[model samples]
Target chain A: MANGYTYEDYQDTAKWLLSHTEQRPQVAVICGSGLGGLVNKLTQAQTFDYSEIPNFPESTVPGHAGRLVFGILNGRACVMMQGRFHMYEGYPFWKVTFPVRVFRLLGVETLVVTNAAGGLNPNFEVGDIMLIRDHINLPGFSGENPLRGPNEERFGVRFPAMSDAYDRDMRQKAHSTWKQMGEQRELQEGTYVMLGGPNFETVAECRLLRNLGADAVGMSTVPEVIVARHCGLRVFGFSLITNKVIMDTESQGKANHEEVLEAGKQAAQKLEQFVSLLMASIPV
Target chain B: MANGYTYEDYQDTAKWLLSHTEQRPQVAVICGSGLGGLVNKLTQAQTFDYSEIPNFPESTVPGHAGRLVFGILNGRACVMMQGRFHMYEGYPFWKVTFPVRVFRLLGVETLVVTNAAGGLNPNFEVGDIMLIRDHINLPGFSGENPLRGPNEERFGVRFPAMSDAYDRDMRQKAHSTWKQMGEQRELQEGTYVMLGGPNFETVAECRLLRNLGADAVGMSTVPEVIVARHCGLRVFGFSLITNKVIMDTESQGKANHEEVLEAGKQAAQKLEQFVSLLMASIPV
Candidate 1:
């Protein structure tokens, strides 16, 4: 539209929807991997395919449904993206997080994003939902960032403080919402490792990711988080632990997007309950 | 010729040569920055502009000559690629190391590569010669590898063994030769950190790279080394300490290719002497 996916694309799309709706959402949610079934829970919903949206970089990767859903959910007006992009798919850092840029313009102040990752933290189980508390930005630190090029003074400062990329009160809301449901299962929280990838990690690589202070690893989210934080969006993330990393011949199922989706299904059953309550009770 | 380039190109280009009767080298010595002037020591040398070689990726980045120098160095048959490609120049991983792949098909084994890197280790100085023992493989491990995707089994296995990536005996020889020569400069012999960049590190990043166990840091060599090692080439590498990491604002210069080349010149004089002696002394 305007060079890369222009801000006008998001503006036009938002204007079209706002013309027809009266709901003001306080939060936006992103469902990753096989977790799309939760979008069915949204009441009085309007959904648009990514293709229907002007200038949004469409998804080519498998298992991503590529749609935006807006509705009343669990007593709060909200917006949720059912599909997401990843850096490993050969998109530039900006395009990968372009939707989040639009979310900022949509008046959604709080964002909830989730992914399915292989557990590197020994304490994690295949079906566990791990809330992302902090991240080690190895890629960001190396200057391979979504924010590497020209800065937009309109969106944020050139250098923004990242010590609190994961907003604390939002994480507390996720934790407490899970508690109120009396679903005694523990929801672990730790650092998430993001790589640009269509390939899963080799055994040696899994060890290195763990050593790099990552508790869970996936290919998406980190770039978007940086962009979101830079644009002043409050970000909260969770990882649905899809598999365990055991460095040997016997413990190997390896990995694939299909397996990740199946794992997401297992965690979504729990995440749905948490989200249902989280929307109703957030501090924001 | 094969799809990329052929030995015949070397053979034809050398036919009318005033040099070593069409000398086609099986060992390719890629000289870096100031160290490349050693191509002059190549006896009976016939040269070809990198542009003249069919399908050869052209050199546009600074510090690299745009041609191939076919000659004999220190009584050993070799083709020295005087100038090399850098990833910061916007080339993909494979494109950056395409010449090395060409070298492999031309019947080369034994890749002797070198570069000028910033000293990340406090034990090192501005003039040390580091014999690369092993690499942390940050880029490759993070999926920026040259050898990914379609497996060229003719080149190597699906996954090559890295346990002894740097030939041990060759490394031992280098150490013994350094000591015997009494060029008692601080010599680094451990892991090198390869980051994808045109920008130097921020202070936090410099510290992280050190904590990640890198003795020195550079942008090149590792991709070439990975491709070389995977192709079953016996590999050896060394780094000229072109500069130390400038972590503070008062540091004299911003890291650039020019400063790296200047430092490489002074260090190359010593390295050339060491290599000539080692080459002449070691029994092939």
Candidate 2:
């Protein structure tokens, strides 16, 4: 009674993708809430709806387009998800990270993920892009892990060292790329904290997280990175600071999904440029 | 399809308990890990095996007895769970907190929960009892909340005020009674952090939790308390500091389930005495 798709099941889906598209994507991107706009930049893109994919879970939340766009991005063959599944959406953790296995099956070497997040760092402001140097997987500590069950040796080891879950070279290379492109915005790097959230944090909760050394907080990315790293894929991810967390109890402002999506709109152009530049920097 | 039990279902279970016992339980106790020995203190105890209770989840972990004992503790009518279902045991958050709903229907006004936790605070030592003033519900933050899916107005409001979740009066009363009883094994109070776990924390993870302002860390209690409080039950919880969290990377000693159980054993007698004395202090 396994709840998630197996490696063999992933291979079957990959085979179907190969038959449909001539493009052999070396890199995969999983879009976050409000950040699906990156798909528009893919030239000659072939769209595959999640419903059509064998054993793939349909994306239920808004801001997620729930499709895989396969084509050439900045001269590099790549596949990117317009939407993703989350634990807060009543999905099994394994199901949330199912696409990463599909990417691995397709022989993708790099995973570039992005999300809209609330800023936890006091210095951060809305629309800031923070590269994820590491993550605090709160769910993983209690066993809401994508890799909790039996391990598949073919994918990776049972206990893979997570010290290098986020690739150092890819992160530094992206930093260099953003710098060379003369990006006006400050590109920051810090830890991303993942929570199982459908509701925004209470004022007290926000204060606690800020004191915890988290720069950004979101609901996704950590699980996908764990699975992607487990399968030996180099990973790079960033967060578009969607809103400043309401840290003070006396504050009247609240965080909403609309705000997150709006921030995505605000940073979409800069993110697209950064992604395009990074993709171009990578060798075909 | 409903993933959790309905209000009607909870009512039926409550009715069954009422039919079986003449004494109504005003207080409900949920035991954690090896701490189930508290059930032995109940006089005239009538056991209701979870397997026999309607919609009650089966407890699978070791140390938990998996039964609810209805009887008298310190001359007060009470119901105590010998074993509790946990999220790490593959149960959904709702299932883990199912009994809280059952307890609400059974007329339980107070929820007294106890867990075996690792000490995150350097001042804490094994065999110390740390009162839960507040909690960091890591799972709740991510949406693994018992009250996530649908709101039951009969039980509580959509957004229940948690500012007074743990009753201040009861906490003060506990302090006064414990002091009167001349029990001085270090009674401290701080934030209890819950992790979804079958595995203990790593050195890095432990250090991070400490840095995040958590004094005691465990795998349970937070979900149950949230549900209990949502249903208008006054919550009072304490953590049995079973072991000191291995914070230093250079330390050769590692945390294990056996060590936790051993600590639970060491603290059981003192806990039983404290609980009995506290229950007696409460009026009929």
Candidate 3:
């Protein structure tokens, strides 16, 4: 679908899902990297493999178990994706954001997305959770934007304003909720940058991105957020500081996808409780 | 050609050019936005529209005339592209960098690339020529690298060292040549960053790119340079500071492709003289 899919195409998939799921989801959660355990915590979960879903791209990267789970999380009806497509994996930008449209079509009004990312800010450390306050879409600055080709006014406006990509009020609730849970030491708020990547960053690249004010860097989330926001969906995104990006040139630390998955596992408990709380509390 | 053209495919195009041209150009020039007229200065130039080239992608953007001219610039034989393909124009990274491989196969050992860029450095001004001493390949930082696919050892190594992407000796010569021509005030040497763009940057994006140490920002040149360098071509690139990127929210400037084209035309005389001088003295 390099030429791009239509609203009809997205509608077909959404209709098929409606026929299968008894649960009507108001919240759509995209579980990032190895963070699918959150979906497992949902009672009476109904799992659908991405391959079974019409118009969905099959996830290729490891640590991403490509499935959709429709169920109740803390008494809130939710639809969660266990894997996601990426530009680095040879998907076109449109295809990478295609599912957001499907989620929008499924009547999902709020998107809570998460990713396991490398900590770019010097102060951030491994296993910390940072609420995504804003984002610098590195690819969007160039022409790799998901909304590049044609405008679907039904989905969103052409040149949609990105000034409020992350909802300010929702961010406050996530932070306040974390403090209430006595997990203040593990929480921080910062900006995220999504690089198109299957390979991790070179030392020089990490430094440049850090200087550009990205507290965390990853390969996903921003495109999904753009599409979610485009369709009038309230968005809340956060990143698990999986590993500290090695800042030094000589004899410093290194990163791999395995480390990212491990960090997701390490922070799973806190993330599950936080998201379940927010998922239940959001107006449905 | 999104699946990507093969090594044999490149050879067929190179073979056709070889049969058509009497001169085997050692120096290849890729003209950037608004600077395509550099090809017009070639004596006895033979032009080939991209449409006629067996596998070349057409240049869709304005300010790019989209032809290959094979002839002599000053005393040196050269193959020059009047207009080039870009990522913003919807070409895959491989196709955007395809011509550089064709140039390499045509026995082009040196790549002289020019682009019209928004000036990001506070010291830079419109119409200034910035010698690209280094570059921050913004797209490549995220996995949009031209060399991402299967390595063609016939072309180059998989992990080519980019520490010397822009030849130091060539940069020094370009700097010295400008001073020799007494147009030193119009010249500077700095790092360029390539963004994928059809639309211009937002204010924050501009500030972030500048903070990351890019003296100029452009949509072209970097992908071409990466591929050319990957195949062992000595790379010499410079940018026309087409417009000063709006420095702040309070009061600044705006730009368009028309203005970028205008800047290229304004500096055409100086660029022609400097490049022709360098072309003749490159010891080809």
Q: Give the per-residue lDDT of model 1 (tens digit) for B1-284.
A: 01222335434433433243356566777776667777767778778887766556676766777667877777777777878888787777777777776677666767788887888888888878889876766775345666545456566654344535667778888888888888767456867778887788877788878876678888888778877877778788798888788666656756777888888777777888777655653444
Write model 1 residue lDDT over A130-191, tens digit each, in one string: 99999766556556677777677677889988779998988887888778778766879999
Worst 10 residues of 2 chain B by lDDT: B157-166
State how far residue B213 of model 2 sits from its true place (Å).
3.9
Clashes of 1: 3
DockQ of 1: 0.08
Show the lowest summed lDDT stretch of 10 residues, model 3 chain A: A156-165
**lDDT per residue as tens, model 3, B221-256:** 888888888899989889988888765542434456
Better of 2 and 3 by lDDT: 2
Kindly list the per-residue Cα lDDT of model 3 for residues A1-42, writing each as its tens digit.
333798899999999999998888889999888788898779
Query: TM-scores, in order shown?
Result: 0.63, 0.65, 0.63
Docking class of 1: incorrect
True-contact fraction in model 1 equals 0.05
Which is better, 1 or 3, measured by lDDT?
Answer: 3
Clashing pairs in 2: A142-B196, A142-B197, A143-B196, A195-B142, A196-B142, A196-B143, A197-B142
